[PDB]
Design an enzyme around this catalytic site. Structure first.
Site, short mmCIF file in Angstrom:
data_model
loop_
_atom_site.label_atom_id
_atom_site.label_comp_id
_atom_site.label_asym_id
_atom_site.label_seq_id
_atom_site.Cartn_x
_atom_site.Cartn_y
_atom_site.Cartn_z
N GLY A 280 0.80 -1.20 0.00
CA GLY A 280 0.00 0.00 0.00
C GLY A 280 0.84 1.26 0.00
N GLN A 281 0.16 2.39 -0.23
CA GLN A 281 0.84 3.67 -0.30
C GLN A 281 1.37 4.09 1.06
OE1 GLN A 281 -0.42 7.17 0.52
NE2 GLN A 281 1.49 7.99 -0.32
N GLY B 26 -7.17 2.10 2.68
CA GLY B 26 -7.00 2.02 1.24
C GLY B 26 -7.34 0.65 0.69
N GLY B 27 -7.72 0.63 -0.59
CA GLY B 27 -8.09 -0.63 -1.23
C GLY B 27 -6.93 -1.59 -1.39
N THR B 28 -5.76 -1.07 -1.79
CA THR B 28 -4.57 -1.91 -1.90
C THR B 28 -4.12 -2.39 -0.52
OG1 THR B 28 -3.92 -0.64 -3.85
CG2 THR B 28 -2.25 -2.05 -2.84
N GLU C 217 -13.95 3.84 3.51
CA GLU C 217 -12.98 3.13 4.35
C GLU C 217 -13.54 2.43 5.60
OE1 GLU C 217 -9.87 5.81 5.51
OE2 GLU C 217 -11.08 6.76 7.07
N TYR D 266 3.64 14.31 6.82
CA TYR D 266 3.87 12.87 6.75
C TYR D 266 5.30 12.44 7.07
CZ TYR D 266 -0.74 12.26 4.56
OH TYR D 266 -2.08 12.25 4.29
N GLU E 43 9.47 -14.53 21.30
CA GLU E 43 9.41 -14.46 22.75
C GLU E 43 8.28 -13.56 23.24
OE1 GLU E 43 13.63 -13.75 23.70
OE2 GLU E 43 13.38 -15.19 25.33
N1 LIG Z 1 0.69 7.56 9.28
C1 LIG Z 1 0.68 7.65 7.96
N2 LIG Z 1 -0.43 7.24 7.24
C2 LIG Z 1 -0.44 7.32 5.89
C3 LIG Z 1 0.66 7.83 5.21
N3 LIG Z 1 0.38 7.80 3.89
C4 LIG Z 1 -0.86 7.29 3.72
N4 LIG Z 1 -1.38 7.00 4.95
C5 LIG Z 1 -2.71 6.41 5.22
O1 LIG Z 1 -3.25 5.92 4.00
C6 LIG Z 1 -4.61 6.26 3.87
C7 LIG Z 1 -4.89 6.57 2.40
O2 LIG Z 1 -5.23 5.40 1.70
P1 LIG Z 1 -4.10 4.32 1.30
O3 LIG Z 1 -4.01 3.22 2.33
O4 LIG Z 1 -2.78 5.02 1.13
O5 LIG Z 1 -4.60 3.75 -0.13
P2 LIG Z 1 -3.71 2.68 -0.93
O6 LIG Z 1 -2.91 1.81 0.01
O7 LIG Z 1 -2.83 3.38 -1.93
O8 LIG Z 1 -4.80 1.81 -1.74
P3 LIG Z 1 -5.19 2.29 -3.23
O9 LIG Z 1 -5.37 3.78 -3.25
O10 LIG Z 1 -6.46 1.60 -3.67
O11 LIG Z 1 -4.06 1.91 -4.16
C8 LIG Z 1 -4.84 7.47 4.76
O12 LIG Z 1 -6.05 7.33 5.47
C9 LIG Z 1 -3.67 7.48 5.72
O13 LIG Z 1 -4.11 7.17 7.02
C10 LIG Z 1 1.78 8.24 5.92
O14 LIG Z 1 2.76 8.69 5.33
N5 LIG Z 1 1.79 8.15 7.30
MG LIG Z 2 -2.19 3.54 -3.89
#
Ligand SMILES: Nc1nc2c(ncn2[C@@H]2O[C@H](COP(=O)(O)OP(=O)(O)OP(=O)(O)O)[C@@H](O)[C@H]2O)c(=O)[nH]1
Ligand SMILES: [Mg+2]
Ligand SMILES: Nc1nc2c(ncn2[C@@H]2O[C@H](COP(=O)(O)OP(=O)(O)OP(=O)(O)O)[C@@H](O)[C@H]2O)c(=O)[nH]1
Ligand SMILES: Nc1nc2c(ncn2[C@@H]2O[C@H](COP(=O)(O)OP(=O)(O)O)[C@@H](O)[C@H]2O)c(=O)[nH]1
Ligand SMILES: [Mg+2]
Lengths: 63, 426, 430, 438
Positions: D10-11, D143-145, D183, D224, D254
């Protein structure tokens, strides 16, 4: 240069930019220049010496 | 002390030989001028195998380059290493071949052989002890398949107690470059079987596949293709030129790989074919080296060993290494592939080790192995030969040159006898 | 060193060579005066101690109305005074005049000049011929030349480029008689004959080059481009070389079938050339399009028998093979069952050279196809449908029967080519 | 030789590992090029970097990490930026189209076209490792991924590797605020897979961490990069026992035994101390006593929940730096004396302690101060039961009239999966009060 846009294997183009852009339009094309083959292939560090390390010469040294 | 006479025929042979004499010149440290420019002293203890001595400390290749057209000799001498080839060693005709086996073997190839037999007799009698011969050509052309097979018959009856190896460029269904190439293949393979000792089938889908997914090149020019096959050819005869723990020349390879005189069709492969951006990021070790060798990706023929069974397998190693890791890995791959090897002969794997790797590398390997899966190459040629010969297509280019349909009739029958002989041992 | 002799017969032949030899001059940098301003031209140009490059060509015509302009214009000094043979009276749209009475008076002089040019070459490749079926000179004197050349020279290669009468429009009325009567000799005295059609070139020029209103020079530019792309292998270095004895063997399966079709790609103008991405696949699938063919016949109706492809420029064999696989995948292009591997490919490094004031764009890569197709039986049948209609009422026959020939030659020339059509359909049977 | 494999899905996962692997490089002294500095190169038989870096014969240290995502806009700048020469060119895998906040796209339609390549990469990194300890997985719930692909991944790692430890670090959809709309659906649909195929999963909230950065670090508008410094600091503190010598060493198998009492309760909380600015660390005293009670404060927890309402089950304390075992044991009994902190009667001794010698490192341009000692808290608390309930209050209101559900069922799944993913958490929730009964 080559491989600016991020598609169609841009990594190998960016890593080998410095090895396939020697010509300066004096020649027609990349294929015409590299009809004999690419300069760096199957190895890198193109200037490297032959080792003289024979197994016998390494094993049997003057004591 | 053990000299190798090199034979290049056709346009394909001329370009492969130009690349081949470039690589081993880099291996032995020979400039395009002809003077040795190197540092180590072990490159000259065995330099007479490929290089004849001349005045001024100049070394010249012991090779002959022939073709019926003069259009490719000008490109040979205009290459990077075209200044070291002897001008006597160019024999050329004034008429083309037309991708015709009849023109290159009976009419135009009848008078061009007596010149090259004079040249090769001059070269072969000048050495102390000739180890053997070596020819590279293409079956899809008129000159290499036509006149080259004439050189096969004449040399094998003039020097009988000598070893004959050929690096033949077999044709393709999808890289079909000639309309009449099934005729020029069957008429070449039939004369090739009884009159040779070792054959290496090099095909172009494998080289195109390697240059696409294994080296990640976007413009795989013939210079890139010829460098792969020239590395294999230099990798075969390493024991004659360099010392090691276990030496093995071409005769020792031919004994253990050829059990029967009609089973002499190998299928080559190489070792580290890594892309340029991925060279830094891999650990180049012996288990990682032999993992790539037995895979069908880097293997230089368009056949799948999974559809057949191996008979004999040879591997020639380079560079300093532990002999235990060679023996353990060869034993492990033999035990795990209990179905891919035949059971009526034990210890199908042969190993040889040299101590000098090529320039810029630290250890390499060469795969030389015969298999039943090479019959897949011959089944597709024979079925396309039969599908076209029944309606007599392109026959008047052959029957109008002195050839007869009986030579066509026996050629398929001997080729069917060869593919029937491969099946019984599977 | 390997050179060929080009012979241009008739008004069509001289006006095709008139535009082809200037492209030959511009490809090797030869000025119209005839000297290099500052050996690949040895295929066409003969050296001289003064540095002059004299072409090794033959021009023949029975009227001086067209060759005197060659004797007048800018290429006056370049061409030899005796390589341009002119007659006293034209054949005037008649086979009998060009084959029996008028054509016999100059054939000895033409053969003398041919022998004088053939004594110069140490190694000769063959003879290329440029003529039209509709003209009297190009119908009769060409047949006399093809008859008298095979006796003198045994197994030399003979290639032809034929201006066929179009199935819809033409510049005469009696040309089916000439078209039938010249095949009775060119069927057995010719190794290969390529075919072009003027209205097909008209459609190509109107649809691709955006020139809605072409000219004979505009057609001859594309024809000379075809010939230059064919003969570039003997001149320029490349990855793969073909010869005049290569594609003849690769495209003639039977002695009765030596009629392929020619196609060129890409055909585009300089205005829209900069926008379209000219890829290897995108230029090799345009050759297989029926609308891009140079002969008004549809290969969809017929079946391919063999194909030869010639590439010029910055071309890599990998894209060529990946495109041949794609063109073998599709069903729209159909092959006979007795030719599983029908492709020939050749590669040349040099990109094509453009002409000042020309129509074609400056492109990096080009491709030319010579493909043998069964669909020419349709072209023969559409002219049989005219020949029977003309011969039923015995029109225009009195000049033929009074100039020396016998009327039974009409029946023989119909019957043998009817048997040839039967041979075509027998080959076309799966 | 004691090594672990880190994968970033994921991102959010790859953005944390972008700022986490730079902390690993500076702790081991690896340059961003990928080699040790030549001024201090020496051979001394060190294996501390082996937990995260694989030695190559040319002196290059390749990290054993896998980066996987379906859109190229987050991977390409890792491929272009400062650390382009550090990562393996094939260990980072990009897709063609993103999942776009869809669990059905990340699990059924798009995620199945990359899963064969990902397990091939995992197999090749596992073949190099002589002795493997576990997997560290980084993703986000929303996120979806980060919801679909890591659920597909986790059910495929269990069928291949039998009894390996699975450690999970998840970012949660914040209770009050959100960067997405659908979400709550993805958070429900990811945890019916990670309940049964995950050995332990840690908990991170974005909205909570904003308050620590605003009050202690006194950064009024954090970004971030600032959040990922704290996230990478906890994982470095967790994995410090394998790399560096110390008095007490804790293995990845452990504290899993010491923090998971029941197979259905494997959700601890993470707390770091001391987080402080560079200026006010000069004024304050930062001994063992005042850093071991700051992690017990409800305001310093990184998940928005109240431990006062909840109940502690087990706690793990990891110490770094100049820490003696004498005052730690004296500080623990001080904590047990206070009646505000409450324990389960079924666990008389809930503390496990670990001491490491090396103090934490800082980064250039960083926000945290250069301190002498640090403590990381890993505590299992019943107070998370409020955190499921506040999102279940969002789930049922959203599912009352079938909002956003037609695109989930349009990709290939069945409408009954939402009901199954609701009833098991209702059963999972009731397991928390049942173990919470005194
Ligand atoms: N703590 C923290 N959370 C992050 C950061 N970047 C993204 N997020 C989290 O990621 C969420 C955004 O959706 P993602 O999980 O990134 O979506 P994705 O994994 O790319 O899934 P897709 O968009 O379908 O490809 C936000 O609600 C954030 O909470 C980061 O740098 N730090
Ligand atoms: Mg993504
Ligand atoms: N494509 C093309 N065709 C031409 C050109 N010039 C003439 N033709 C063709 O030639 C035909 C006319 O016959 P001609 O060639 O002029 O007649 P001829 O060969 O000189 O015979 P005679 O005039 O009787 O002596 C026309 O139908 C045209 O199709 C040309 O420049 N380009
Ligand atoms: N791998 C490889 N194949 C080549 C090369 N040059 C030519 N060929 C092959 O040779 C075949 C054509 O052979 P040809 O030139 O007609 O043989 P010749 O008539 O005897 O000279 C084609 O199928 C090509 O694939 C080369 O440099 N490398
Ligand atoms: Mg005329």
């Amino acid at each position: 240069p080559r491989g600016q846009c991020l598609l169609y294997n841009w990594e190998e183009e960016r890593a080998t930019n410095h090895l396939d852009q020697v010509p300066s339009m004096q020649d027609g094309s990349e294929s015409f220049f590299f009809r004999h083959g690419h300069r760096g292939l199957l190895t890198m560090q193109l200037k490297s010496p032959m080792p003289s390390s024979t197994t016998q010469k390494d094993s049997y040294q003057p004591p | 002390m053990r000299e190798i006479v090199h034979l290049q025929a056709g346009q394909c042979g001329n370009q492969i030989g130009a690349k081949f004499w470039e690589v081993i010149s880099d291996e032995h440290g020979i400039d395009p001028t002809g003077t040795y420019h190197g540092d180590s002293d072990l490159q000259l203890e065995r330099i007479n195998v490929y290089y004849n001595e001349a005045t001024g400390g100049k070394y010249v290749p012991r090779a002959v380059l022939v073709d019926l057209e003069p259009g490719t000799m000008d490109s040979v001498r205009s290459g990077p290493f075209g200044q070291i080839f002897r001008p006597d060693n160019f024999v050329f005709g004034q008429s083309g071949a037309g991708n015709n086996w009849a023109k290159g073997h009976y009419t135009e190839g009848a008078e061009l052989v007596d010149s090259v037999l004079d040249v090769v007799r001059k070269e072969a009698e000048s050495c102390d002890c000739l180890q053997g011969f070596q020819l590279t050509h293409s079956l899809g052309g008129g000159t290499g398949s036509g006149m080259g097979t004439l050189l096969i018959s004449k040399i094998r009856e003039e020097y009988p107690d000598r070893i004959m190896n050929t690096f033949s460029v077999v044709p393709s269904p999808k890289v079909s470059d000639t309309v009449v190439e099934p005729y020029n293949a069957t008429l070449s393979v039939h004369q090739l079987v009884e009159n040779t000792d070792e054959t290496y089938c090099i095909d172009n889908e494998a080289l195109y596949d390697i240059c696409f997914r294994t080296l990640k090149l976007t413009t795989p020019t013939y210079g890139d293709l010829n460098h792969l096959v020239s590395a294999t050819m230099s990798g075969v005869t390493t024991c004659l030129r360099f010392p090691g723990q276990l030496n093995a020349d071409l005769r020792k390879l031919a004994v253990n790989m050829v059990p029967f005189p009609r089973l002499h069709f190998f299928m080559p492969g190489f070792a580290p074919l890594t892309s340029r951006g991925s060279q830094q990021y891999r650990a180049l070790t012996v288990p990682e080296l032999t993992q790539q060798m037995f895979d069908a990706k880097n293997m230089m023929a368009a056949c799948d060993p999974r559809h057949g069974r191996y008979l004999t397998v040879a591997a020639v190693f380079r560079g300093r290494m532990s002999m235990k890791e060679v023996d353990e890995q060869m034993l492990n791959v033999q035990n795990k592939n209990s179905s891919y090897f035949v059971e009526w002969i034990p210890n199908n794997v042969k190993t040889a080790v040299c101590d000098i790797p090529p320039r810029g590398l630290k250890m390499s390997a060469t795969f030389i192995g015969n298999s039943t899966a090479i019959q897949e190459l011959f089944k597709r040629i024979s079925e396309q030969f039969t599908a076209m010969f029944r309606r007599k297509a392109f026959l008047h280019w052959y029957t109008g040159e002195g050839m007869d349909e009986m030579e066509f009739t026996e050629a398929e029958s001997n080729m069917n006898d060869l593919v029937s002989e491969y099946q019984q041992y599977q | 060193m390997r050179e060929c002799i080009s012979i241009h017969v008739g008004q069509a032949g001289v006006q095709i060579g008139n535009a082809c030899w200037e492209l030959y001059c511009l490809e090797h940098g030869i000025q119209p005066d005839g000297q290099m301003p500052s050996d690949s031209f040895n295929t066409f140009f003969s050296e001289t101690g003064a540095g002059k490059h004299v072409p090794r060509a033959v021009f023949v015509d029975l009227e001086p109305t067209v060759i005197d302009e060659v004797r007048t214009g800018t290429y006056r000094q370049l061409f030899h005074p005796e390589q341009l043979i002119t007659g006293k009276e034209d054949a005037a749209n008649n086979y009998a005049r060009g084959h029996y009475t008028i054509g016999k008076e100059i054939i000895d002089l033409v053969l003398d000049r041919i022998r004088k040019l053939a004594d110069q070459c140490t190694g000769l490749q063959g003879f290329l011929v440029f003529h039209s079926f509709g003209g009297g000179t190009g119908s009769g004197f060409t047949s006399l030349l093809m008859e008298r050349l095979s006796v003198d020279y045994g197994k030399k290669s003979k290639l032809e480029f034929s201006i066929y009468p179009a199935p819809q429009v033409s510049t005469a009325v009696v040309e089916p008689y000439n078209s039938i009567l010249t095949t009775h000799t060119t069927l057995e005295h010719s190794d290969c004959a390529f075919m072009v059609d003027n209205e097909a070139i008209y459609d190509i020029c109107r649809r691709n080059l955006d020139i809605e209103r072409p000219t004979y020079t505009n057609l001859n530019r594309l024809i000379g481009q075809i010939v230059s792309s064919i003969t570039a292998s003997l001149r320029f270095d490349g990855a793969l070389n073909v010869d005049l004895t290569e594609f003849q063997t690769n495209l003639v399966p039977y002695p009765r079938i030596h009629f392929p079709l020619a196609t060129y790609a890409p055909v585009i103008s300089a205005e829209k050339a900069y926008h379209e991405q000219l890829s290897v696949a995108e230029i090799t699938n345009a050759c297989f399009e029926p609308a891009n063919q140079m002969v008004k016949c549809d290969p969809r109706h017929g079946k391919y028998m063999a194909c030869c492809l010639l590439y010029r420029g910055d071309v890599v064999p990998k894209d060529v093979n990946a495109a041949i696989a794609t063109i073998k995948t599709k069903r729209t292009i159909q092959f006979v069952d007795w030719c599983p591997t029908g492709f020939k490919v050749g590669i040349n490094y040099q990109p094509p050279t453009v002409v000042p004031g020309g129509d074609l764009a400056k492109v990096q890569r080009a491709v030319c196809m010579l493909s043998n197709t069964t669909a020419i039986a349709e072209a023969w049948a559409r002219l049989d449908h005219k020949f029977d209609l003309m011969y039923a009422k015995r029109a225009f026959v009195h000049w033929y029967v009074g100039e020396g020939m016998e009327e039974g030659e009409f029946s023989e020339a119909r019957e043998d080519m009817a048997a040839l059509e039967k041979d075509y359909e027998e080959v076309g049977v799966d």
